[PDB]
Write a protein that binds this ligand. Structure first.
Ligand SMILES: CCCCCCCCCCCCCCCCCCCC(=O)O[C@H](COC(=O)CCCCCCCCCCCCCC)COP(=O)(O)OCCN
Ligand SMILES: CCCCCCCCCCCCCCCCCCCC(=O)O[C@H](COC(=O)CCCCCCCCCCCCCC)COP(=O)(O)OCCN
Ligand SMILES: CCCCCCCCCCCCCCCCCCCC(=O)O[C@H](COC(=O)CCCCCCCCCCCCCC)COP(=O)(O)OCCN
Ligand SMILES: CCCCCCCCCCCCCCCCCCCC(=O)O[C@H](COC(=O)CCCCCCCCCCCCCC)COP(=O)(O)OCCN
Ligand SMILES: CC(C)CCC[C@@H](C)[C@H]1CC[C@H]2[C@@H]3CC=C4C[C@@H](O)CC[C@]4(C)[C@H]3CC[C@]12C
Ligand SMILES: CC(C)CCC[C@@H](C)[C@H]1CC[C@H]2[C@@H]3CC=C4C[C@@H](O)CC[C@]4(C)[C@H]3CC[C@]12C
Ligand SMILES: CC(C)CCC[C@@H](C)[C@H]1CC[C@H]2[C@@H]3CC=C4C[C@@H](O)CC[C@]4(C)[C@H]3CC[C@]12C
Ligand SMILES: CC(C)CCC[C@@H](C)[C@H]1CC[C@H]2[C@@H]3CC=C4C[C@@H](O)CC[C@]4(C)[C@H]3CC[C@]12C
Ligand SMILES: CC(C)CCC[C@@H](C)[C@H]1CC[C@H]2[C@@H]3CC=C4C[C@@H](O)CC[C@]4(C)[C@H]3CC[C@]12C
Ligand SMILES: CC(C)CCC[C@@H](C)[C@H]1CC[C@H]2[C@@H]3CC=C4C[C@@H](O)CC[C@]4(C)[C@H]3CC[C@]12C
Ligand SMILES: CC(C)CCC[C@@H](C)[C@H]1CC[C@H]2[C@@H]3CC=C4C[C@@H](O)CC[C@]4(C)[C@H]3CC[C@]12C
Ligand SMILES: CC(C)CCC[C@@H](C)[C@H]1CC[C@H]2[C@@H]3CC=C4C[C@@H](O)CC[C@]4(C)[C@H]3CC[C@]12C
Ligand SMILES: *[C@@H]1O[C@H](CO)[C@@H](O)[C@H](O)[C@H]1NC(C)=O
Ligand SMILES: *[C@@H]1O[C@H](CO)[C@@H](O)[C@H](O)[C@H]1NC(C)=O
Ligand SMILES: *[C@@H]1O[C@H](CO)[C@@H](O)[C@H](O)[C@H]1NC(C)=O
Ligand SMILES: *[C@@H]1O[C@H](CO)[C@@H](O)[C@H](O)[C@H]1NC(C)=O
Lengths: 344, 344, 344, 344
């Protein structure tokens, strides 16, 4: 039913499932905006496919040819099925709009499924190629941040009663390499191109005259070519073509609204803001150097992933509340850190 | 069946599922009133869609055109399907009420699903954008309250046998920022606007003459335009239009009753009452300062979320019972706290 | 099938599911009588809806109009569907009993579902508004009782080898407030009113002549108004109306039997008997004062909830067996308590 | 539905399920490229089979023979079923394209399923024959790497405050044996051959005239051979043949794109690059000798499997970050290793 389709595709965790494995425990591995874009671009065409053939919206068979009254039920069924299979056969049918509109009307669900698959492909490539590496690197970075926070609080407590910036060096090294950012931009660009092509196709499909679904059909090949009792042609109409056009314009609207989001996603350096690591600069055990901005490198992408999935880090949360309290400046950062006692 | 739909949509945890993740363990992340509003506004139109096409209420096909007796079964089926697809084609049909009523009668389930999706969108945006931040902040606040309660009871026990207000400073800082409250008000306002538009549409749909479902249909395009055996027109009726109007007025009543709730929700500062933190003011380790009221800021929203999901805090429950006992004043707050022995 | 519906709605845990959350572990949060009343009042109309359209009891379509023999199958189907949709349209049909009986016959499942939803609403309001508070308070009370029992047995063992009545003070304070009892009485009263209205409706529906299901139908609007081959009217009958009346009288009987139960529930103070706390009065560490009776206050409701869900408390069970043994008076209460050794 | 098939076969973990057993905990046991190739080559033909007979794309029965009007419904059904079963019987039917096109049109789903099974066979043979051995060997290798890393860090810590290369000897021994690599190459080659044969078949099927689906059928064997009322022949058409050809060309495109991937897979030594063990050469406890390249031996395959599933090793990750930091050369490898403190 329509409501069942809605529950499956919008109100359920459709493509929102976290990786089912212990390797990525709590790691999104995909930005929220990218996940939203993929979920829409994939589950919208599927939802429209399901809707267009819902038991309520669908009168019945997808084509009716209006055989003569003399024709029996199965003769008329032969006519309808023959014309359905003959939309491909150009000789059989003669339609003013041509044969491409008939092809599109017959295979619209296939085309929507193709667009959905093509849009799901780049996210899958990301999740299967560049996701494990970033997951491992980010897990190491979070562990290093937790360890340095613990060491700093232990030092502060000892004072009240190595020291090498490994994480900073690793981030600096990531500043050079750009394979991950190149893959990310390539997959986003392919998604954008697929969306644009889908918009072109949907606009063309919705621009039809709405009468191209009605085509003339001739079961006059073979032994029936010179038969007399059979009329030379029939009036066939492809039902649900109006529904297809409505859903196609809906998908076109959604995709044109979505494309600016993908374009904004492509410009990762601009998105790289609100320095996540700036909060850690007040730790004595952490060097006061952010050095993450203004670069078409994997460092900006790692900064984005950190700003996305750093809320799970207790040390980061503690430092964030310390920073927020520092806005008033009533107290002192080391005193607040010592009082917090948030090692684990 | 009707009962199955009821069980799925009203008697089950439809959209009442808690976040399936360890990050939010026991945190609602959504006020009870907001959750009720979203659940109604989403699962009502879906329930009505399912009901309108239930196997019992539905006689059968959604349109019947009453072809002549001479017409065969599949000729009549062609007529019915053609008219169903031609509700869009204005030339084919001539109805007194126009063609918009026919469009609405055909696509009412789609319109209800659209309203449900549009009403579910703002809650989803909230849960995916502003929910993680408030979850982390509120978890930190609850942990700080538990820790300060433990410290105060330990101090009292030591007396019988830092001290910095970090949580108060954090709340004071939240008094300034307003991004969360702005997002909350924006999503509530969008929900209200969607509800009002849905009410307008449902009122218009229910105001129809009830005879607009009957339209005249002409299969007279193409080779059949000059055919003689076919009548110039047919009498088609869209079945289930009365059911659609009944369910639309039901939804209109529900939404007009719900809109005052959304308006009351918009005025968060008025809702900010029954100070949750007032109970903690009797703790020696906690400063006697509430400072949370009369502000279009995130502080009021945090106060609401606390008053919502603070019952899970054992220290808060203990302080609440101490406060309630203090109404008589027979005993002493520190003595009762020491006797409680409710560290964990 | 009928047996499947029975298993789902009477032999299964339909609305008998305990709260699926760790917050309420073993707490009913709903009295047994109230749960029975809600389960009946909700799952009876749903069961009757399912039964009335069971594949065995149902001959087929819900209306047959007996078109002339000259009419084709789909002409007759048009007639039947038109009349089904025209039960609303007063002009189309002319029935002796009127049009309200036809409306009721068509929408009886909707009306039963409406009554079920309206009866499920007050229980849901209770469980979502006043259940968390009573759950927290009752959990605290049980914990306090366990702690005082442990302290008393420890004192007895020490003798053989604070002391403040916090729980008693909390109960005394609950004696004043009445918001919970007011909500309980309001929800019970609304349930009773809904049940009475349902009884009125079912009595009216069952009082019909049983021939109102037969109505005269006229497909004579539009181009067919002046058509000659079509008869001026048809004889239509709404099938399953007898089944609807039978199930409606069954529901009426059940609801009239149930209403006295709801009225008895409304009088909570009378139900407040068999003092649960009287057993704890023999503990040296517990003050000898019950002070819970004869009040339209939340104290009586808390006493009811205690008498309901106190069997899970080992200390209460031990004290109850001590009390039962004290009926003979052969031994001594402190000696029996010491010998029991039931700390945990 | 189409969307359901898509969710099952592309958006779900179809053939992506990890081995359901504790023996292989986190071990892929199959390269990512090989898994992708198998998943495509298997779930594409299945998806196309499901699509070709979807309730929306399918008009109805797969063959209609257009019996005379005098023929009754079940006479026409006999004709259609007889011709469907007589596509095999060459005498019954006379088609210009022959009888092989009819066989293919009737059994296209069977042929796609056969290709899917044949392509799934080599992966299954691998997973059931050569997977346990490589799993055990690789688990031992990872355990040895973890142990040597722990020993080296312990030695470094002791300095700050056996020694036999068992793993290197085992890898060197693997350099000689080649049974695993021979099995891998054989299964890949069989997969490639199956893909090529499938491409040949699909090209032949798509190269048909598109009118071979129309064949002449004669129910003139037995008592009906000399019957007069029955026409000497009928015009039968195999519906869905156009859909079969479309999906066959789609599968052909996918397989021709995939075959280069399989050919690249066959050349494992070229794939053996980015020495995984080179990072471990900086450990004092590990001998400075990689000795893994330029060989048609199991050593290259083991190197590939290591580069695939070594990210799960904490010691390897630590050494990798040490290597990346060494690019700048600011610090010292032993000092960084000591500071890391990443034993477990
Ligand atoms: C994806 C979207 C593809 C849509 C665009 C396809 C480009 C077609 C260009 C060729 C057109 C062509 O040959 O001309 C028409 C015939 O088309 C044809 O006979 C070819 C029809 C094109 C194929 C449409 C079917 C798409 C199936 C998708 C399946 C995906 C499934 C994946 C799981 C003639 O007619 P006319 O009207 O152009 O001219 C008639 C008067 N000059
Ligand atoms: C959402 C609710 C939308 C309802 C309001 C739509 C505004 C329509 C304004 C244009 C009306 C128009 O062009 O005039 C009518 C034709 O309408 C048309 O032909 C356009 C019909 C409007 C589209 C209705 C279909 C809604 C589909 C929703 C799908 C959602 C799915 C999402 C998953 C003519 O006839 P007349 O009677 O106005 O005048 C006839 C005598 N002057
Ligand atoms: C709930 C139970 C509601 C039953 C009582 C409804 C009160 C009806 C009062 C108005 C009656 C009225 O206007 O008069 C009749 C027409 O009724 C009408 O045309 C109005 C019919 C009333 C609506 C019945 C449909 C209930 C649908 C419930 C849907 C719930 C779904 C929720 C998920 C005329 O005929 P006559 O025989 O009275 O007089 C004919 C000779 N004077
Ligand atoms: C796998 C793909 C197999 C396709 C290629 C099969 C090779 C056929 C070679 C023999 C052809 C033959 O005997 O000649 C035709 C008859 O074919 C026949 O009667 C034999 C038809 C071949 C069998 C096709 C059915 C495949 C079933 C697959 C089932 C798999 C299920 C596994 C779970 C005559 O006609 P003509 O047109 O060639 O010449 C007619 C004018 N000279
Ligand atoms: C997804 C991508 C590939 C879709 C590409 C656009 C498709 C949908 C449409 C939009 C405009 C279309 C073209 C418009 C006009 C003509 C001229 C005609 O004589 C042959 C077909 C041809 C050349 C059409 C082919 C298909 C076409 C290119
Ligand atoms: C992503 C955005 C830009 C998509 C917007 C849809 C655009 C591309 C659509 C809307 C209307 C469409 C046109 C409608 C009609 C025709 C006439 C036909 O003979 C050739 C294609 C052509 C010229 C279409 C090309 C694509 C088109 C311009
Ligand atoms: C969800 C929102 C967009 C719904 C908006 C209201 C819809 C349901 C209805 C209510 C009143 C309607 C209008 C009433 C009168 C007319 C005048 C007519 O000559 C053209 C259509 C037009 C202009 C209608 C368009 C659709 C309309 C605006
Ligand atoms: C949220 C609340 C205010 C909704 C209440 C429903 C209101 C808006 C409904 C009920 C009846 C409706 C009217 C019924 C009939 C017509 C005549 C038509 O030619 C234009 C629209 C118009 C004038 C409708 C406008 C909207 C309307 C006034
Ligand atoms: C659930 C509640 C609202 C049900 C209320 C009772 C319903 C079922 C029935 C019982 C008696 C009925 C009334 C009996 C007699 C008449 C007089 C007639 O000229 C108009 C309808 C009217 C006024 C009926 C309206 C519906 C009615 C009130
Ligand atoms: C909860 C208990 C009291 C319910 C018992 C059912 C009662 C209320 C039912 C049973 C028979 C019913 C009556 C049957 C027939 C008529 C005649 C009609 O023109 C008006 C309503 C009226 C007068 C009904 C009113 C309600 C009624 C009296
Ligand atoms: C999967 C593998 C086995 C498929 C092999 C190719 C199949 C699909 C096709 C492609 C070309 C075909 C051949 C083309 C021409 C002829 C000559 C004819 O007089 C007899 C059949 C015969 C000999 C065909 C047999 C089947 C054939 C070999
Ligand atoms: C893996 C790649 C190379 C597959 C490409 C498909 C090739 C092999 C296909 C496409 C068109 C096909 C040809 C189409 C028509 C005929 C005529 C027939 O009487 C014999 C087979 C023959 C000659 C086919 C042989 C196979 C063929 C050449
Ligand atoms: C049909 O009859 C015509 C008469 O002109 C002839 O040309 C044609 O070949 C016949 N077709 C068949 C299939 O026998
Ligand atoms: C139908 O016949 C009329 C006669 O006036 C003619 O004008 C029209 O073009 C014909 N239509 C078709 C589709 O042949
Ligand atoms: C039907 O014919 C009658 C004859 O009196 C006429 O008044 C009426 O308008 C006609 N109806 C239609 C719908 O043409
Ligand atoms: C049909 O009749 C013919 C007449 O020539 C005869 O040869 C043939 O054997 C008969 N067939 C059967 C099955 O009786």
């Amino acid at each position: 039913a329509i409501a069942q389709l809605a529950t499956e595709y919008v109100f359920s965790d459709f493509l929102l499932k976290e990786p089912t494995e212990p390797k990525f425990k709590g790691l999104r591995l995909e930005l929220a905006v990218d996940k939203m874009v993929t979920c829409i671009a994939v589950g919208l065409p599927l939802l429209l496919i399901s809707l267009a053939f819902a038991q309520e919206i669908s009168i019945g068979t997808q084509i009716s040819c209006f055989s003569p009254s003399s024709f029996s039920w199965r003769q008329a069924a032969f006519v309808d099925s023959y014309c359905w299979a003959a939309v491909q056969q150009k000789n059989s049918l003669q339609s003013e709009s041509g044969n491409l509109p008939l092809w599109l009307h017959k295979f619209f669900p296939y085309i929507l499924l193709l667009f959905a698959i093509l849009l799901y492909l780049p996210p899958l490539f990301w999740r299967f190629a560049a996701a494990p590496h970033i997951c491992s690197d980010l897990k190491f970075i979070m562990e290093e941040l937790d360890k340095v926070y613990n060491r700093a609080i232990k030092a502060a407590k000892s004072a009240r009663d190595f020291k090498y910036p490994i994480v900073e060096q690793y981030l600096k090294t990531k500043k050079n390499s750009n394979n991950l950012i190149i893959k990310y931009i390539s997959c986003r660009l392919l998604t954008l191109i697929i969306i644009l092509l889908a918009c072109i196709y949907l606009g063309y499909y919705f621009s039809l005259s709405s009468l191209s679904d009605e085509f003339v059909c001739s079961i006059k090949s073979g032994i029936l070519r010179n038969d007399s009792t059979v009329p030379d042609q029939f009036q066939c109409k492809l039902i649900a073509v109006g529904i297809f056009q409505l859903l196609s314009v809906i998908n076109l609207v959604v995709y044109v609204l979505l494309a600016p989001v993908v374009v904004y996603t492509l410009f990762v350096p601009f998105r790289q803001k609100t320095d996540v690591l700036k909060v850690y600069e007040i730790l004595p055990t952490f060097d006061v150097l952010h050095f993450k901005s203004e670069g078409y490198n994997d460092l900006s992408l790692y900064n984005l992933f950190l700003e996305e999935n750093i809320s799970e880090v207790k040390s980061y949360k503690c430092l964030k509340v310390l920073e927020n309290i520092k806005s008033s400046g009533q107290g002192i950062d080391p005193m607040l850190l010592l009082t917090n006692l948030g090692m684990i």
